Assembly symmetry: D2
Homo-oligomer: 484 residues x 4
């Protein structure tokens, strides 16, 4: 299977012909040949986007909405193809990739729904005879740069909404998930969007991505990935004063208090901490439990972790966990386990690994110096920390450089609200999973987890600017020359 770039309405090879073979994390079988594009390809996409910009931005919102409703209809027909690739390319289980595709349907529909309804403001003027209003205008060409864990839904949340308010897009997917990206471009092409409005360039982040980030004709970059990458991108973007949206790592706390249904809390914790092998930005990566239920919680949680079924995700619809995306991820998880053991952690269960598969390793007896307390653990290694009271719960929850999401389980309204208030995160959820996400809510973090919010109108805020415009209806006298 050969995959291509999508530039100015045309599927085409990179200008060098350079290509790369992509393999499945599941068994190493070959999947496709994909472009290894370079700077010239990115520049061509940016140039196409730029030349398409004025026509795309200046048609009525309702027309852009019609293209998006069309893209929605095309997506609905391609659902099976997307699910297939999210599994074999990305390692996702059926339930995982099904969920991603449902959400992605909802995201495209949401962008379409909202395009006509993004409003500016009419202001009171402090001056006589003055009309004072504020228009919303699209930023221009927008770079879209994405990760590999939820490659479809993350890409589409950015792409659909950015397009909705009249920006054009240059899209560079994660090198482990280029085929998903190529399918998105297939969907867009079948939807018949004007040439240059959406462009796909497949290539290395440090080459194609950096060209996008540093190009003068790009107005904004919306980026999801590691904090370190985000910081580099932000620095590079400064040269042209382009704005950025950065959704970076998380190390979300899940806080379990002593008044919970302990069995339910364990079920919830298992799903939150380990869904998609814990490879989720808002995965519950640090579990924090009140000592009065800690023993029962830990037993029950481990009991349910043991029930998890790890297998070839292609095999059937009931597989719980698939493989990690590549061998480097397995190597890193081993470093995390090695660190925890060396610092006196107790390995209650798991740690076995074969190929790219990894059995969830669960630690207790951890302290704040463990790497799995200090770093984002983007994989199935999880600490459980026991605390004596709610002050400690909050202290532990905030003892991280990250600040994405978080959750508290309790039946007490005062403890729930106090903890929600006190925990330093961009998002918070009482009595639910840490990775709750809807299409039209402001999704994003604080501290090292990034800047900006995406989802519905918040995506619109990110890729538009306000424009104050006035009409003065009366002449007046001016202070200079005073001789007049």
């Amino acid at each position: 299977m050969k995959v291509a770039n999508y530039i100015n309405g045309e599927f085409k090879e990179p200008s060098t012909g350079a290509f790369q073979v992509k393999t499945s994390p599941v068994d190493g079988s070959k999947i496709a040949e994909v472009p290894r594009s370079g700077r010239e390809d990115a520049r061509e996409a940016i140039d196409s986007a730029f030349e398409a910009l004025k026509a795309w931005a200046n048609i009525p919102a309702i027309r852009r909405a019609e293209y998006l409703y069309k893209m929605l209809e095309v997506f609905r027909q391609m659902k099976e193809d997307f699910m297939k690739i999210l599994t074999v390319e990305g390692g996702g289980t059926y339930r995982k990739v099904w969920g991603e595709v449902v959400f992605t349907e909802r995201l495209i529909q949401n962008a379409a729904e909202l395009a006509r309804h993004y409003q500016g403001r009419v202001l009171q003027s402090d001056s006589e005879s003055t009309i004072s209003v504020v228009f919303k205008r699209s930023k221009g060409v927008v770079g879209v740069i994405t990760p590999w864990n939820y490659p479809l839904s993350i890409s589409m949340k950015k792409i659909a909404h950015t397009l909705a308010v009249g920006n054009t897009v240059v899209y560079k997917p994660a090198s482990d998930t280029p085929v998903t990206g190529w399918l998105i471009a297939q969907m867009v092409a079948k939807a018949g969007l004007p040439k240059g409005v959406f462009n796909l360039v497949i290539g290395p982040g440090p080459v194609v991505g950096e060209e996008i980030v540093t190009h003068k004709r790009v107005a904004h970059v919306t980026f999801t990935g590691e904090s370190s990458t985000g910081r580099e991108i932000a620095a590079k973007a400064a040269g042209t004063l382009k704005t950025v949206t950065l959704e970076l790592g998380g190390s979300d706390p899940l806080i379990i208090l002593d008044d919970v249904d302990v069995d339910y809390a364990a079920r919830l914790a298992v799903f939150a901490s380990l869904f998609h092998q814990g490879q989720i930005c808002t995965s519950a990566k640090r579990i924090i439990v009140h000592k009065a239920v800690a023993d029962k919680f830990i037993e029950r949680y481990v009991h349910y972790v043991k029930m998890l079924r790890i297998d070839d995700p292609r095999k059937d619809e009931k597989v719980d966990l698939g493989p990690l995306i590549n061998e480097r991820q397995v190597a890193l998880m081993k470093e995390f386990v090695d660190d925890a053991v060396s610092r006196g952690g107790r390995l209650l269960i798991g740690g076995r690994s074969w190929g790219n598969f990894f059995e969830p390793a669960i630690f207790v007896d951890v302290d704040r110096n463990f790497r799995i307390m200090r770093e984002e653990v983007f994989g199935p290694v999880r600490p459980i920390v026991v605390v004596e009271n709610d002050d400690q719960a909050v202290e532990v929850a905030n003892d991280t450089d990250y600040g994405l999401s978080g959750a508290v389980l309790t039946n007490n309204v005062n403890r729930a609200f106090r903890i929600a208030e006190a925990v330093e995160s961009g998002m918070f959820h009482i009595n639910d999973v840490t990775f709750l996400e809807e299409s039209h809510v402001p999704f994003g973090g604080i501290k090292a987890s990034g800047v900006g919010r995406e989802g519905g109108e918040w995506s619109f805020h990110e890729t538009t600017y306000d424009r104050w415009v006035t009409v003065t209806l009366r002449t007046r006298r001016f202070p200079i020359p005073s001789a007049l």
Copy 2:
């Protein structure tokens, strides 16, 4: 100042810089000594930052109405200090009585505006796509905010940033332009007398590349709001990335004033003189490139030059009717001389002006320019102004947009279709029909596009820059989860 020394203001107290280092601030008007002021370093900036950080939670956590009360107290104090602010704006900044009067009136409105809005900054209650789910969005303050400002409108620019940032729960570390330190210290005087809690507002006087950079690179600083040169802005934005702090950047402008053929030409000339030369053209939103339709160009140019002839340049302390004061320093005079010399060298026609003496520089008006003139390619932060004659509205627009900047802009015309088409096509953050390019109100989104920066300031827009949205949910019913599937 006859009874007090100029100092930093850190955690509730007026201190010396820790090195004791100082330097003499002199008047641009006559070189006379104004005061010794601090020359702080990274240590003093650090102490201010830590003070702001330690004050943060108590200041953010009180009810908004409490912060508004403090801003109302500040407003009352400002009204008492108005003459002192005007005096210093004139003698330290070189502004005329009418200029500094306007700045002080606007500053009063800015402080009041931030006080008015503090209680009313709202979040959102959302419809959940899920059953049994409450879904809402709170507004939270960003934290410690660095405020770094220029010398041209040092009071109103500083206070727009300071008053609004404080209103919504942030604490502040403020570093004024080195050419206007006494204005910053007077601001500190004002805050101190309003009795804000210690650490909530801090003033550090010292070099941008030292004190400023420390503010921009420090990890306990959440956001920087900055006004100044575009090159300085690019530098700050890149330094900002290291800690993922956000920035607000109000950078240069090269605003187009477009004059069409159906205008009252005399009114156009009067408007244009004011727009282009007020405060010696030292305004971010000064009308820096005048663009006139060929059908009225000859009479416009004659009229414009006629009124420019009347401009009275003098010592701004002399009386209330002085039109233009001096430029802020000698580097600026040297730079204007270059702009003038370049235009003449390139074949430009100097219609009037061109003399300078000390820090004083006369308006210098050119025609017969092309896009390669320095005064068409760069921001001319002084009284040197090109007039460009064009043949139609398309050329008006093409010329208007032929710039790296994109702050403001204006068109004069009585034709509704021409006005609206030109307003829509000009590439700027702000735009004004039948008014000056530097229109500004306390509560409107002020800011640019392209090289003129990012973000908006004024009223709720300032609040948008220095707060973040926080999505919170409550789920009222249990459910089953997909893993383990065996269950």
Copy 3:
């Protein structure tokens, strides 16, 4: 034709069984048998909507949106049937019923798009430890009462938005357009909305309408019709403190200044004043022209009026004007012409009538005491008035009980804005027709023209309420007993 009520999910005859025959305005021929329902039929519909309410109000908005998207799909299939009936029962020409059906599609889609995005507010509390927010709640059972001129679009605007946000509906169409009402019921039935959510009762206003207006379980009535009818409904509604939306008559001013393209201005005026025989709430009913262009304007206007083709609207697609809705309208226009001639008016053209057809009658030399200047002329009789300046234009424009829409033609920005500002109307359009309408803007008037606004989120404002809710997180001392 098999026309019936639609109550609680079932098409059924009125309780008494009474029917009445609907004939065509075009030629008097039989069109269909329709119900003549009574109070019992209205009460049964109301009870059904009331019983259905909680289930409909409490599902997620996305679920209500789904039903509306389904309604949209059904409507798209019924287009030809709607155009047919609007022409044959309403007398609308092809181009008119086309426009109405195109706009109806947009109305339904608009209601669907917005359902999920109607937001409340999170407030700053002046108290410590207090959470303070505002929810949006549906008002409840909403009565929808509608007129004969744009029966489809006007009804669907009210019905679609009202349902979107969680109200249930009892709908009573105009007695002269009952088949359109029935076809609407068909669409909703086929869309599969839960029983009782939407209900159609075909009956006379003073019987079925008044029951709807006075019933205790109806929360709100949205009404469009004559100002006199509106005043009555508003008084009857007072008993049960139900709120109302009232879109009443208009007598909109079209103001033509001396700097215009006179030929264009004439073309615009003909369209705005006489489309659908001037039976439009926002018809340009009072034309006001500057003396410097009056003669040329009047000449050119009369010229294009004379070109208008009046005919059987069923014949072909290029018919300009069809019949008036009934004999009473013809009689009323004759009265209008009688009064005008009587007072010195100069009849420039038209006035001929046969059956329900009527040739547009255009008058000059009028003064403020003419009926055609004092009342809403819901038909093809139009005064042109000459004024000497802008002050006079505004004075004549505002010299009316009404205040719905209005328009000014000019290329001068100062004159356009000063006039826009000075004219007393709920709506105003610079360089366009008086009856400009979009699906998502606030549509409605001031003065005798009614109260409230409809369209998009403005319709939501009408049929929801704000609900302030707090949570206090700390205990405190109270002032009584003071001894405590």
Copy 4:
């Protein structure tokens, strides 16, 4: 010496008719006051109509300046206002101090917000079309108020309606005319342009109905009894003017089994009996969970017993003052007698002397009791014991009213489920039923009225939206088709 305030001038009514305002405390004469007729009201209405265009057309900042001036004068008049709220209205020091502090916040609030009421810029579905929505003031606004919180309620309607460019015709409750006069004094001293604000003192069915039926009045904002509200709404129809109606309430206070029972009793005493229970959002029906019901009733009655009833002028710690008039006492007596007769168990109180009524607390009541079926605008209170949360909600909702409501519980699930199911315009978890802030939407559903007041919600009531477009291209029209 008390008079009307019409078009910048303090003047006697046309007919010269007056009447005597007496204190509810001891019947003492307070002042002679206008008894105005339809012509003093027509005069105020024409004054406001004629002042309107100048007032609405100045920039908002200038109206805000006038309100900040009003605030400065109000702060000077604080003591005067308290004194009159007490002697004329019957309020204790603590009640009137609260009302005055809140009123100050109300005037400041309207001033703060005047410059910031925004319209919208829209996306047009058409090409070459600018599409925006302006906010415009409705015009002359009638303000008609009740007697229980006459200052705060009046000023909430008046400050906000003024802020956004309406002019005002104000008729206060006949039982509290001096407070309305003091307001006119504050306004006169702030120097508002003549006719912008007008005070007419007189009878509701004369002065009030003229305001309500006058053609040049665009809006009436009303607070009072539901029946009066229905009458006003019907009359308003004839000129298609809009109305804001804040009517009675019968608010439920729901107390669940997991509470701090003592704290709940304290909160309940304050909520149910402050200002002698004469509050629209008073906790008028107390609903308590079986499991804590006995200890709650005991603790609640214990604290009610502690309430000090006395001349509110006597000192700052008096808990309760009198009812407003003799007729209120007689009504409460009917409420008490009906409950006794129906089998109710009177736990405490029920006595009355002069205009002072002793809080009467009942248990063992049913839904047929008058104090369960009607608004009890005084210190007579039923306690209903329930077995589960479903019963709590059923009892809470078994009323014609729907103003506010509250639940006390530490359980998040029960709190939210109950909050959602209670049919009320407002609701408070773990606080009193009558919580109120200056900038929040205050109002009810069902028989408690329509519309919301407070900050921008006040603005919404007394402004309309105006869609204005500019079309920048010409186009072809579909008639005549031959063209």
